[PDB]
Design a protein around this ligand. Structure first.
Ligand SMILES: Cc1cc(-c2cc(NS(C)(=O)=O)ccc2Oc2ccccc2)n2cc[nH]c(=O)c12
Length: 127
């Protein structure tokens, strides 16, 4: 039943970078989805005790979520955009493995992934 610790949002060993895309992912792409109607389940780590889902973390092994993704951006945790983009693909994949096609939660995940995949069709350029 228990909840594991959340993903790390800071890491001193890990090198950090503030590219102009990561700035965009936080200032534009992440606040675009954060405000959406379907955003709330993905706004913090899943609570398998509260949800009474004791099997969730026996099937999901790389948990991810936007709460976690948001702070990583704020901590400059990533080295480049694709690192963060891949925290998103993990999140959505976790939602489509643990649940079934058509379940309410995946319909939101699919809604988001498609507003997602549309906002990162155009990142800003480098310096
Ligand atoms: C990714 C995700 C998020 C949630 C979920 C999270 C919270 N809040 S919290 C504090 O983050 O854990 C509350 C209800 C939730 O279940 C919903 C199931 C259907 C429609 C709306 C919500 N779930 C539940 C089951 N499977 C999942 O993959 C999942």
């Amino acid at each position: 039943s228990m909840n594991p610790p959340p993903p790390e949002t800071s890491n001193p060993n890990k090198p950090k970078r503030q590219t102009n895309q990561l700035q965009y992912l936080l200032r534009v792409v992440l606040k675009t989805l954060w405000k959406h109607q379907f955003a709330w389940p993905f706004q913090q780590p899943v609570d398998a005790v509260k949800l009474n889902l004791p099997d969730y973390y026996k099937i999901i092994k790389t948990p991810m979520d936007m709460g976690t993704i948001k702070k990583r951006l704020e901590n400059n945790y990533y080295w480049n955009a694709q690192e963060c983009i891949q925290d998103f693909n993990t999140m959505f994949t976790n939602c489509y493995i643990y649940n079934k096609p058509g379940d309410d939660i995946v319909l939101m995940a699919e809604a988001l992934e498609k507003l997602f995949l549309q906002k990162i069709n155009e990142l800003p350029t480098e310096e």
